[PDB]
Amino acid sequence: KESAAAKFERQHMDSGSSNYCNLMMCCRKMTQGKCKPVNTFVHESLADVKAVCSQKKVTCKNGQTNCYQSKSTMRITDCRETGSSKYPNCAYKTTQVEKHIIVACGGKPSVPVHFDASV
């Protein structure tokens, strides 16, 4: 069983092409069983992303208060299923942007366990 912290790294970290999302959503296993409809990858170092857990506190989309917003914008790529996508033939639109990220943090040490939003 993968931990929540490990799952966050697999689904969202790509520390560092129109087909980017199609390749990554597949390699990171987000097209198994169903096409995850939307996902965001973050291209900053794992350390900079983990540091968000000690940055600005904000409320989570689900109402929990263990969420944090990055002090700076970060380089991210949003992957969104296209209208033609249909499991098991998933298809995604790749959009690169620079936005702040909001993540839920948990565990000891407190690390990101859920990508909540980009703002």
Curated annotation (Swiss-Prot):
Allosteric regulation by both substrate and reaction products. Seminal plasma. Can reach 3% of the protein content of this fluid. The modification Deamidated asparagine is found at N62. GO terms for cellular component: extracellular region. Keywords: Allosteric enzyme, Disulfide bond, Endonuclease, Hydrolase, Lyase, Nuclease, Secreted, Signal. Its main location: secreted. Homodimer; disulfide-linked. This is Seminal ribonuclease. It comes from Bos taurus (Bovine). The chain holds residues 27 to 150 of 150 of the full protein.
